[PDB]
Design a binder for this molecule. Structure first.
Ligand SMILES: Oc1ccc(/C=C/c2cc(O)cc(O)c2)cc1
Length: 121
């Protein structure tokens, strides 16, 4: 679910999902178009594609369970949708962690019309 994703993001990065990742760049948050602005935005692009791979799941609302083993996120076994949603969220949270070094506050609330270019999943 979205709230679980937000808590996984906070755990990984120490940033609050809202506002750090809810409206960042072209792809983090509602909507997506154009060329992602940086590596963090690319995490969101791929996360969007990952949710797009699950057309008959409901990634915003369906809850999954995970634990940590030696620090690392381990998605626990629910329904097939829940497992797949968890893997998408896990990847994006790790990706955010990996790209904290280049996160730029200039891309928070980035305006949609600047999202020029095109990117297929
Ligand atoms: O690819 C994406 C990556 C991150 C997000 C952020 C989502 C989000 C939205 C909420 O209302 C609450 C929340 O805790 C998280 C959306 C798309």
């Amino acid at each position: 679910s979205l709230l679980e994703f937000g808590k996984m993001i906070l755990e990984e990065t120490g940033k609050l999902a809202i506002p750090s990742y809810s409206s960042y760049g072209c792809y983090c948050g509602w909507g997506g178009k154009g060329t992602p602005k940086d590596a963090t935005d690319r995490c969101c692009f791929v996360h969007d594609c990952c949710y797009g791979n699950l057309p008959d799941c409901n990634p915003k609302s369906d809850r999954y369970k995970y634990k940590r083993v030696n620090g690392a996120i381990v998605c626990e076994k629910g329904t097939s949708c829940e497992n797949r949603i968890c893997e998408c969220d896990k990847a994006a949270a790790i990706c955010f962690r990996q790209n904290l070094n280049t996160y730029s506050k200039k891309y928070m609330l980035y305006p949609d019309f600047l999202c020029k270019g095109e990117l297929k999943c």
